[PDB]
C-alpha cells in the first residue's frame, strides 16, 4: 500500500537534507510507514551520519506524506572525492485484521542511497558511465570503473537490443574499482546501466585486442 517516489536516491552533499515523497495508495485503509537507513553492508544505523525522519508515521487512506533525510556532523568523515553507499528503507505496517487463519503481506522497499559529496557534484544528465573499460578474460570481462561514482551494470551483449533485453546478472561497481563478469565474447559489445533517474541508457563499445572502450 505504501510506496516511494523513486528507485534510488542521490544525496547532494552540498545541502543539509532532502525529502522523499511517500504515499498510501490504498484508498480504504490506513497504513503505517517506517523508514530507516542502512550502511554499505546493509546493516542498520540510527545515530548517523545520515538520518531519516520520521522513523514511523501513520498514513490515512490515500494520504500523501514524505520522509526527510538529513546528515549529522560525522558526515564530514566520509570521503569527499567519491560516493559513499547507503540504503533507504520504507516498510509498511498494514492495519491489523483480527481474521482467523490468515497471512498478511507487508511490503518493504529498499533502494540505494548515494551520498555524493560537493566536490563531485554533477549537472543534470551528466554521463560518467562512458568511462568504463572492458577487458576480455577467461569466461567474460573485467570491467573497470575509474570514476568516483557507483555504476550499476544491467546489460552486456553484442547489440543494443541484447544489452537491453539479454539475460545479465546485474552488478554494481564501487567507485575506482573493477570486477569480473562471466560473459560470452562480443565483437562490438554494448553495455546498459541505470542512471540517477532510473533510466537505462545503452553505451556502444569498440575493442582493440582485449581492451574495449566507449565509442568516441
Amino acid at each position: 500500500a505504501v510506496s516511494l517516489d523513486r528507485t534510488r536516491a542521490v544525496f547532494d552533499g552540498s545541502e543539509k537534507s532532502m525529502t522523499l515523497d511517500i504515499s498510501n495508495d490504498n484508498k480504504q485503509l490506513p497504513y503505517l510507514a517506517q523508514a530507516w537507513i542502512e550502511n554499505e553492508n546493509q546493516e542498520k544505523i540510527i545515530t548517523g551520519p545520515v538520518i531519516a525522519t520520521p522513523p514511523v508515521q501513520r498514513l490515512e487512506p490515500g494520504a500523501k506524506s514524505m520522509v526527510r533525510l538529513s546528515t549529522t556532523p560525522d558526515i564530514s568523515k566520509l570521503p569527499q572525492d567519491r560516493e559513499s553507499l547507503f540504503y533507504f528503507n520504507l516498510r509498511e505496517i498494514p492495519p491489523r485484521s483480527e481474521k482467523a487463519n490468515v497471512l498478511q503481506i507487508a511490503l518493504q522497499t529498499k533502494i540505494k542511497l548515494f551520498y555524493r559529496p560537493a566536490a563531485i557534484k554533477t549537472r543534470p544528465n551528466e554521463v560518467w558511465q562512458d568511462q568504463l573499460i572492458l577487458n576480455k578474460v577467461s569466461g567474460g570481462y573485467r570491467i573497470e570503473n575509474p570514476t568516483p561514482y557507483y555504476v550499476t551494470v544491467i546489460g552486456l551483449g553484442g547489440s543494443e537490443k541484447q544489452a537491453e533485453e539479454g539475460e545479465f546478472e546485474t552488478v554494481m561497481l564501487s567507485p575506482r574499482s573493477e570486477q569480473t563478469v562471466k560473459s560470452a565474447n562480443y565483437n562490438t559489445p554494448y553495455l546498459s546501466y541505470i542512471n540517477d533517474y532510473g533510466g537505462r541508457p545503452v553505451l556502444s563499445f569498440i575493442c582493440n585486442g582485449s581492451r574495449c572502450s566507449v565509442k568516441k
Binding site: 503481506i105 511490503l107 533485453e165 545479465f168
Partner: protein, 150 residues
C-alpha cells in the same frame, strides 16, 4: 512531449492485492490432509506491482533482475518453511513461485520469466507439518515482501 521540463524519475513499485488488508485467507487448519501425510490445500495470491513501469519492451523488472524480491519471516522446521503465530501448534507455512521454487526466509527468490504478460507476481502457499503434535486452533502470520532495487 515537452522538450524542456523538470526531472522525471522512475518511481518505486506500489504493491496491491485483491484484499484491502493485503491478507490471504488460509482456511481452517487442514488436520485431515495433514494427518494423512499431505499438506493443506493451496491458496493463490497475486501481488501486483504498479506505478513503476514494471513491464518493458522485452521484459520486466523482476525477470531481468532489476528488482530482487525476498519473503521475510521466521524460519520454521526446515529452511523451506516459515513459522506461524497463534494458538495452533504443529504447523508451518510454505510459499512457492509459479515454477515450484520454494521460498526460504530472507533468501532472495530466483529471477524467472513471467507468464500471461500480466504485471503481477503470483505465489502459492500451503500449510505443512513442522514435526510437532497437531493442535487445532487459529493461527496467524505477517510476512515481509521485500523488493530491493538495483
Amino acid at each position: 512531449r515537452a522538450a524542456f521540463h523538470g526531472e522525471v524519475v522512475r518511481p518505486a513499485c506500489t504493491l496491491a492485492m485483491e484484499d484491502a488488508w493485503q491478507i490471504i485467507d488460509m482456511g481452517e487448519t487442514p488436520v485431515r490432509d495433514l494427518q494423512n501425510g499431505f499438506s493443506g490445500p493451496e491458496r493463490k495470491f497475486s501481488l501486483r506491482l504498479r506505478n513503476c513501469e514494471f513491464n518493458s519492451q522485452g521484459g520486466n523488472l523482476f525477470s531481468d533482475s532489476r528488482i530482487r524480491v525476498t519473503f521475510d519471516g521466521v524460519r520454521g522446521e526446515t529452511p523451506d518453511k516459515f513459522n506461524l503465530s497463534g494458538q495452533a501448534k504443529g504447523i508451518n507455512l510454505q510459499i512457492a513461485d509459479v515454477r515450484g521454487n520454494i521460498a526460504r526466509a530472507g533468501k532472495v527468490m530466483p529471477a524467472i520469466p513471467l507468464t500471461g504478460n500480466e504485471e503481477a507476481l503470483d505465489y502459492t502457499l500451503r500449510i505443512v507439518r513442522n514435526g510437532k503434535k497437531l493442535e487445532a486452533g487459529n493461527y496467524f502470520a505477517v510476512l515481509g515482501f521485500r523488493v530491493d532495487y538495483e
